[PDB]
């Protein structure tokens, strides 16, 4: 006879959306445990009750003979409370229930890398779920119980510890809109049969990250067959390369410098330009001389050379810095990377180049969302946000204002113009924004693959006041196409649209906007 200690199963703080939608919920949950030398002496009951827990009859016996010296054994665990009453129920001698909580995540695959999961232990490895551990976690109570010679338990006696729960956790994440990225970021890696990608939307006001989606993904409530690389969360944890995707900085920074303007021409004829050893290559040759916006429309990397050259890779360096390329988000992901902005002490033309067009810098495609947001909220960089933000935090002018308006004009008009990217128009909206197609780096060697493709999109949207930056990554399209404009400019298009309207956001450009929204 004597007194054993019991724990109390802590409640897991709730995790939510912006709006209150459950993301981790701990739900109650019934395991039933029995005592074998109760069990030893109620043996008629077995054969019913092996059957009411779905067990063979010999197996189940086999179990409890083997054990018939314990005290305690589990019979079950993670039966719905009603399930464990039933069982409770029948009156088996030795047969006792607790009830237990088991994380759920009912959202499933669709928000799986931002929030991540606990393991069998309840402590936080992947996600949201570790980086706000401590604060999630409950801290379990203890109970006594009094039991006899036999392991009969006779008493509850006292409670010596109260459980105390976690705490509730509101993220910047709108799942409507994330529910709309992650359908279309898999819709598009399907039809282009790509290997990855991933998708991220930013309020551009005020820094919250409204939705993160990556392929491939995972199922975090039953993870049996999970794979390794399936549990990247690619958005803040993959650097690649952005190229022509950082033009519009290139060309901020040449605005900025005092020695540049819209209208100047710059030669670009045909379509190379050497420089010692390496030679720059525009994709597209259908020109010899480009206004500043016809560099970025035509996305010419012999005409924003030539600009780099004139104005100092100084210049660039710094603008890119600015917007937070190669810095530290602050937002403490797990697994999350810096980057890397180059920064030699004397820059090559060859640096220098590379640098404007976009190569010899690793960037995040949170980085790159975040860079679009500051040139979106007209030049004005606020902090990034993964959690609900109440009031518009200050922001810091890394763009002035007079730039920034000049650059979104020229994105606007990469979308809208002839010889554009077209398929990056939003129905019913003005949008801004720039397609990118980088080569891979070469497996095994330095250099670039030949036929291996990363497919960019970053812009923003409504042109007249931007509310929403978003990026998308396509990796090794292989089946429709690879240049960023045919492969994740649509893919821009529908998703922009989709989140434009969930967030209510009144259309700009009634001309093209669909019959249900000429009405509203
Ligand atoms: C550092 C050396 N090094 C590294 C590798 N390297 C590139 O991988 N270059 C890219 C490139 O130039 N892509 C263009 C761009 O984004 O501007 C295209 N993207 C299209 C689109 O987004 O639809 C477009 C607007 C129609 S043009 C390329 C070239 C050829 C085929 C695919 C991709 C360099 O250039 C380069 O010198
Ligand atoms: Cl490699
Ligand atoms: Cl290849």
Same mark, same amino acid.
């Given at each position: 006879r004597s007194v054993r200690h019991i724990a109390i199963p802590a409640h897991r703080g709730l995790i939510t959306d912006r709006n209150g939608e459950p993301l981790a919920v701990s739900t109650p949950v019934t395991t039933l445990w029995?005592?074998?030398?109760?069990?030893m002496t109620a043996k008629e009951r077995w054969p019913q009750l092996a059957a009411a827990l779905g067990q063979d009859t010999k197996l189940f016996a086999d179990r409890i003979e083997q054990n018939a010296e314990r005290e305690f054994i589990y019979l079950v665990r993670g039966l719905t409370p009603e399930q464990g009453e039933g069982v409770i129920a029948l009156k088996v001698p030795g047969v006792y229930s607790i009830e237990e909580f088991r994380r759920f995540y009912p959202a499933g695959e669709v928000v799986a890398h931002a929030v991540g999961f606990t393991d069998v232990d309840d402590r936080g490895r992947e996600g949201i779920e570790l980086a706000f551990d401590e604060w999630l976690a409950g801290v379990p109570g203890k109970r006594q119980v009094l039991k006899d010679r036999r392991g009969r338990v006779i008493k509850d006696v006292q409670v010596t510890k109260n459980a105390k729960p976690g705490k509730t956790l509101a993220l910047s994440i709108d799942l409507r809109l994330q529910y709309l990225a992650h359908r279309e970021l898999r819709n598009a890696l $399907?039809?282009?049969? &790509?290997?990855?990608?991933?998708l991220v939307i930013m309020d551009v006001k005020t820094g919250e990250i409204l939705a993160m989606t990556n392929?491939?993904?995972?199922?975090?409530?039953?993870?049996?067959? $999970?794979?390794?690389? &399936?549990?990247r969360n690619r958005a803040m944890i993959d650097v690649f390369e952005p190229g022509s995707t950082v033009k519009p900085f290139s060309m901020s920074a040449a605005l900025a410098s005092g020695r540049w303007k819209p209208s100047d021409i710059v030669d670009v004829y045909p379509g190379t330009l050497q420089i010692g050893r390496y030679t720059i290559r525009d994709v597209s040759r259908n020109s010899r001389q480009l206004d500043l916006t016809g560099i970025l429309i035509k996305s010419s990397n012999v005409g924003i050379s030539k600009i780099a050259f004139d104005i100092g890779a100084e210049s660039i360096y710094s603008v890119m810095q600015q917007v937070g390329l190669g810095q530290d988000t602050g937002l403490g992901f797990p697994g999350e990377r810096v980057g890397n902005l180059p920064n030699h002490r004397k820059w090559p033309?060859?640096?220098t180049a590379t640098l404007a067009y976009g190569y010899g810098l690793s960037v995040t495609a949170i980085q790159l969302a975040h860079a679009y947001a500051a040139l979106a909220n007209d030049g004005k960089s606020v902090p990034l946000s993964m959690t609900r933000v109440d009031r518009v935090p200050d922001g810091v002018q890394v763009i002035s204002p007079e730039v920034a308006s000049t650059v979104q004009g020229m994105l606007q008009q990469v979308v809208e113009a002839q010889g554009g990217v077209f398929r990056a128009?939003?129905?019913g909206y003005h949008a801004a924004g720039k397609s990118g197609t980088a080569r891979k780096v070469s497996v095994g060697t330095k250099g670039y693959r030949e036929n291996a493709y990363r497919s960019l999109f970053a812009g923003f949207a409504p042109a007249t006041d931007p509310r929403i930056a978003m990026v998308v990554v396509i990796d090794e399209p292989s089946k429709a196409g690879y240049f960023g404009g045919l492969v994740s400019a649509p893919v821009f298009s529908k998703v922009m649209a989709g989140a434009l309207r969930l967030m209510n956001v009144p259309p700009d450009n009634l001309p093209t906007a669909t019959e249900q929204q000429q009405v509203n």
């Open positions: 029995a005592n074998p030398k109760e069990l $399907l039809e282009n049969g &790509a290997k990855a990608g991933s392929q491939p993904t995972y199922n975090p409530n039953n993870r049996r067959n $999970l794979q390794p690389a &399936a549990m033309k060859a640096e128009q939003v129905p």
